């Protein structure tokens, strides 16, 4: 009984994100579309305040599950109802996009280290060093 709900949760949540961002040939997909319409309306009034709390929480891809778990735990600790369940999806959608967007500078830093690591060991930095360093690049013209 539970496992049936769990398996359906994947399909429902997928359609929820699919239509939330937009603002699906299945019965579960229609549930996601209905929830995405409601979730978008609630998101239009109280999103601004959560933008700040997400700034201080600073969720990264590493600790995202840890923070999502105890946050959702406190959400349903005093009871469960259809309203609180919908809010869980709204939070998961926002937590997903937030951690993804704010991780770009984090991903660029890793890519920056790949280039630096490459230039060190493949004589690229030495070649630049002999031409005067990076300041020499300013002489590229005509």
């Amino acid at each position: 009984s539970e496992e049936q709900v769990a398996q359906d949760t994947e399909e429902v949540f997928r359609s929820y994100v699919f239509y939330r961002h937009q603002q699906p040939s299945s019965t579960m997909g229609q549930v996601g579309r209905q929830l995405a319409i409601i979730g978008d309306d609630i998101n239009r009034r109280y999103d601004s305040e959560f933008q700040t709390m997400l700034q201080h929480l600073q969720p990264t891809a590493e600790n995202a599950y840890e923070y999502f778990t105890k946050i959702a735990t406190s959400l349903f600790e005093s009871g469960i109802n259809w309203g609180r369940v919908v809010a869980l999806l709204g939070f998961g959608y926002r937590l997903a996009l937030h951690v993804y967007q704010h991780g770009l500078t984090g991903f660029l830093g890793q890519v920056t280290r790949f280039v630096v690591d490459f230039m060190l060991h493949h004589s690229i930095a030495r070649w630049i060093a002999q031409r005067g360093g990076w300041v020499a690049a300013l002489n590229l013209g005509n």
Binding site: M53, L57, S74, R84, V86, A87
Partner: peptide, 19 residues
């Protein structure tokens, strides 16, 4: 704590809707 303030609002926004 941030987790507390965040989850405390989801429950207020969840219960405010279903009612």
């Amino acid at each position: 704590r941030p987790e507390i303030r965040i989850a405390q609002e989801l429950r207020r926004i969840g219960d405010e809707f279903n009612a």
